[PDB]
Amino acid sequence: GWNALPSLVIITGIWTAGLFALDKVQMFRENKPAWANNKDGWQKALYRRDWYLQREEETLAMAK
Amino acid sequence: RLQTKNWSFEDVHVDFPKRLAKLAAETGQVQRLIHFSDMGADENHKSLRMRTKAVGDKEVLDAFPDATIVRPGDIVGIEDHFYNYLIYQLTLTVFAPVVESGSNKIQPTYVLDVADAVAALLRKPDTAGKTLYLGGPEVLTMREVYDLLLKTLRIYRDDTVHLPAWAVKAMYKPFDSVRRMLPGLPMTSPLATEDYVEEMLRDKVVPAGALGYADLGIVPQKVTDGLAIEPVRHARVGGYRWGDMSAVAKDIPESVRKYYNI
Amino acid sequence: MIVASILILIVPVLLSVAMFTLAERTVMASMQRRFGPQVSGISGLLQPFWDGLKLGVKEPVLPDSSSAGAFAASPMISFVLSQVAWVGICISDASFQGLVIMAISSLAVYGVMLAGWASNSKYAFLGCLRSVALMVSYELSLGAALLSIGLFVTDGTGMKCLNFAEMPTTPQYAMLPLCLIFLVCILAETKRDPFDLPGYNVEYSSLGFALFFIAEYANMAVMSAIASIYFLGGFSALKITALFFAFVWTRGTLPRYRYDQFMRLGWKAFLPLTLAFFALHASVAI
Amino acid sequence: YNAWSPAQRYFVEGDHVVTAEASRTFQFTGLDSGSFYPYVIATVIATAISTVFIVAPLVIAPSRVDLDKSSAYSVSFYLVSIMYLLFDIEIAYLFPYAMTHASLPMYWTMNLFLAILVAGFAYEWGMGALEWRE
Amino acid sequence: SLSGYFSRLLEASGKKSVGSFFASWEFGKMLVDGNLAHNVLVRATGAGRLVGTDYNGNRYYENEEAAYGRRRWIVYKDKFDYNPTTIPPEWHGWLNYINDYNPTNTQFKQPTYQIEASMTKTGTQTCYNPKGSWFSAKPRNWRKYESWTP
Amino acid sequence: AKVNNFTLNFGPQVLRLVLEMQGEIIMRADPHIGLLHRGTEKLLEYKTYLQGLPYFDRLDYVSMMCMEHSYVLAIEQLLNVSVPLRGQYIRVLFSEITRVLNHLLAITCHSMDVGALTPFLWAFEEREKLFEFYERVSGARMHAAYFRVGGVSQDLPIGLLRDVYDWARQFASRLDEMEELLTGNRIWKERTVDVGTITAQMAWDWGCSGPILRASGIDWDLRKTQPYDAYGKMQFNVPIAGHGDCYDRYLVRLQEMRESLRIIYQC
Amino acid sequence: GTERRPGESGAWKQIERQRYASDWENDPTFKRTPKNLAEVLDDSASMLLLTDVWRGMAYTLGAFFDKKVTIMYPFEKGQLSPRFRGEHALRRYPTGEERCIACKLCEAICPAQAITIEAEEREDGSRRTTRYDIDMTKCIYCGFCQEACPVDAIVEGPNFEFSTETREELLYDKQKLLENGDKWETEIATNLRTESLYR
Amino acid sequence: AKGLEFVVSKVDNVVNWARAGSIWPMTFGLACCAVEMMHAGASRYDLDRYGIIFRPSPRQSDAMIVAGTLTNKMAPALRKVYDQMPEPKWVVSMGSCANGGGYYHYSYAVVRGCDRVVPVDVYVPGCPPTAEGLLYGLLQLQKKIYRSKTTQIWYKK
């Protein structure tokens, strides 16, 4: 009935707005839209190497 | 029992009883005024509530000369302020402070006996203008009361600690200088004040030669055992419960044992 | 940033639980040719909030014959497990995410059994065992369904997983009977119709009771999101609403089973069917 | 956790890396892939919230003491619990199978495993142990 | 027509403008009381006509195309404390579907002793009390004999 | 082994039951009654015959005028009073309206106890229509005090039969949409089939009557074997089933609603 | 349908009986065994894939999109008749004199004994009551007092909304009953103009 | 002082809006009056529209509706169930039997009013009261809940 429509619309709107906000927050944390993908040992090794080499590039930049 | 930013001890124990006695004497049809005070009420008491109570008793006997002053001891009951706070002190706290050796004497009484005492006062015309002290048939110390509660509750760890009175007052001092400018908080014990510490340094018993229960024809009930101690037996560990109930179910009839699944 | 992400997740979960319990009342009313809550706020939109605030200022009944710690711990455990399961849905990247949520939902049995042990009621002890037996019996069909689902979940590198982001974005048409069994298993886990015979919270009042119902509705939303991920090609707001409407629709139109009847159903119908489907899907997957 | 050796830091020297790792933000695409750390924080935060839910009606609610308010208002479960234990162990065994790209001898070994399972289950079915009349 | 909707809303609420309507405490209670909200915003603005007004200010509407038993309704003038005890007896039988008579089509005979309808006084201290009550001006002792006074 | 019975107390909140179980199987049931015993048999000795009539509305308060009927007939037989024809027709018509009200409540309360909630809410609006029929002739929705010694209390108001016909024109559709939720449903069958079986010898030995007796294969209706008022003129069928089931009693009660509709149309 | 199956039997004695003997095949209310392939597929599509749950679901979904029977009390009311027995009231003549003449017939007929009457003669010689009480918490709202009254003095009016907060507010004396009659007089007269054709 | 008293008064307003809009009663369907209470909960009158949910246990119950006659055998059970409800709670007495004994007032087996066992907030008259009259009584109970000022009383203690 017409009385049941507002609560059912509000559930959809709540979940849409909450998922949009959570997406923006986690996108700000991770800076890439594939942070939730499955990662094996090779991909974990690649990310850890990338992080440490980025830190090394930052260390070498503050010396010139 | 505690002071608040809206109400002080003099407002409740002094000013209101005086105005009540005056307005009662103005009507002409009031034949009896029963005012309730405490057994430890004294004008030379260090506790403020006992002193304001005795001052208000004087004002009531001044303004209404046939008013009866009633001074019972500690009153036990289901909704009391005596065993309930002591049980909330034995449980629900890391430790329970006891002022000094706990050798101060008290005379607790049952609430139904006080209710009967009011009707017995209303019957007897001689009791107008007098002062009565209501106390039970047993004189006990606070250590004995704590031991009775610990035996009744079936607690096998004495969590009380005996402390000097200055240490107890030092504990209760921060929550007594802030008792005003506050509308009154829930679950604050009336034992967490210096006035209780001053009351614990004195005896609170019936004076010699005073009028008591016997002059009213009342034999007061025992407080330590019987119906008065049944509410604290419900707060023991596990529950009250009956027992195994099998030694006496031997010669009980047929349907009863199956009904109780014995 | 993790604490911020978790709180930003927690807000719509509780808001959605309030709106679910209102929407259940109103949809159940519309099927029965009435209105449901309309007075309490405009269009009745304040009724769950006034229920929560009414229970907030309600007296907490602590029975002085029970163990106070387990009595307090049971609804806290239920609520915490529901919130943690939601975090596992949305703030995880783990390889075995579906196994993680199955492990969490297997822990949810403890609140029922702690409520049964704590409160000193004769039939609370009788009903907690029945409710636990129902949840325990249908967990196995849920696990075998997860086995059938995981046979086809592979990521880009070729590794098989239960990661939710690697699930396909199309409905799984090949597993329609397994989807129906999954939905009836969800109905059995949440103790809804037709398995609502067992209650265990007969001694709880005020916000402990409120914690029990928030946990129940949040677990229903967790299982709805899980079913939409596994079978409906993704997690979405519309799918959550549609599956909730379906559950309320089933509650409107059906009577409930006896205890031995749903026990025979779960141990002679659903478990052999899920195991046979697992064997058939393993034969297909070679 | 922070790395404690030069080999664990990909042989990057300096003090900027040590402080940068110790004060890093959590990142699934940095050093914390597959980490399960948000599960602990969620437990702590939800326990805090439910404790606040428990404590609050002890302050803002009325209360009255009564002795009546503080009062009370089979072997099939053994079957269910023990059978669930054994079947849960069997499903845990079957899970490494489904997470592999199995060859045919793996398939036939798994089917021998399942056959032993369902043979014991069918024996208990045929003896009338899944009929919950008692 | 939305102009018809707003004209119906203003004639039903008794306000002068939409700005006066939305900034009123009546709209504030209609945000928290949904029964009044439905009655003013949906029912009174729908299909139907105004029948009449009683002396307490309540308005009476009817719609013959509605279902049976939902043809007639009232808009109370007291928005904050609305009560059915303020309906006069010449509107009571019309609104309760007892007869089809109201003052707009029927001239009732008015007795000279008739007391007008007003809101109930229960819950207050000006309610009805028997003559032996404490709240009376002079309580009665109901003795059926006279005592001797010397 | 030597298994003692486990006993259970079933509800103070007005039936009290003391069960015994041998596991999940009941061995004994003992109802404890008297929580609604108000002593109406003693109070009727202190009333005149007209004064004591509204006591009977409050015996089976789901079916009021039928309780009035037997007291009125017992008085009329000793008084040697004849009832006129129109009063007999009115009594038969309102007795059948009463039976429809009772069967609506009984079936839907049973199905709500089993777990189906919607048929209750569907049938109570029809119950509201029949309560309006009670109120239009007696001024009371339930305790009518309508049947009197020698006839009925007041005449039928002009316009009642028109509306009773308008309700009876759609009642079969309401009973049809009621059966779509319950009759061919497996959960309802699995709850009701072969539960609590009553054979004919046990039915007569235990003093049974009504739709219990017809579901065990016994053709016994007092409106056809020992008729009263104008029930001998009425043309209707007696529904018969033969298992003694809960399911068979449910089907017999639905058919009895159909037959009551037939008698209502004839009146 | 009302047909039975071996297996859908709710009990145990009949479940044991149907799986060890073929006595159920003699009973005409049972569904027969399928005889060919298409009948087996029909039976399996009945048992598996439900389709009996779905008919009830289609009916309740049709009811979801249908009309509602709720009235919005107290802005909307129910339907009653002029014979309705509500709050008791005492009536006057159009001049303003009481109709009641203290005959004590309504007090005699009252099965609840909810009426207490005392009377004497008024100073002009008239026969009038000095006490007329109705205990509304003893009243059963039968209307017998309305039937027994020969001058139409006591009535049950059309008011049903008279719930109070204290029980002392429901012990009506004579003055309040006259006040009720003075309130409800025009409606009572309109009702009695129709109901006098029947009574 | 003025601001904090204004805030305290608004806390009472919100709390009373919550408590009146969320009454969960407990059913004592003793007799005749229970059928009219069932009719009040049905689709025509729809007690659920006003936020009323009937609850099986006394621990979740906010009110008690005594709908039917009370006997001497039933009075301690009613008292025991009343004592198990938590605060704040209300009692609605429905119909003549619960109000004052009614038609069984002079019987050897009946309690003359449930006032004699439990205290009562709202009395609904009738035998039976209509479902609409019970709605009137429940709206009056809501009006009684609205006039309460709990935090204003606490603030001035």
Ligand SMILES: COC1=C(OC)C(=O)C(C/C=C(\C)CC/C=C(\C)CC/C=C(\C)CC/C=C(\C)CCC=C(C)C)=C(C)C1=O
């Ligand atoms: C037939 O099924 C149903 C039941 O039976 C199973 C029920 O029992 C109930 C009633 C029980 C309810 C609603 C309790 C559960 C829900 C709660 C407590 C709502 C949770 C909401 C939260 C935490 C958000 C509200 C808080 C806010 C906005 C913060 C406010 C803060 C400030 C203003 C500063 C309903 C509605 C129901 O349908």
Ligand code: SF4
């Ligand atoms: S209506 Fe009935 S109970 Fe009421 S006063 Fe008249 S006779 Fe007595």
Ligand code: SF4
């Ligand atoms: S109201 Fe009528 S019946 Fe009753 S005493 Fe007066 S005149 Fe007689």
Ligand code: SF4
């Ligand atoms: S007051 Fe009347 S309707 Fe209500 S229970 Fe008593 S006799 Fe039945």
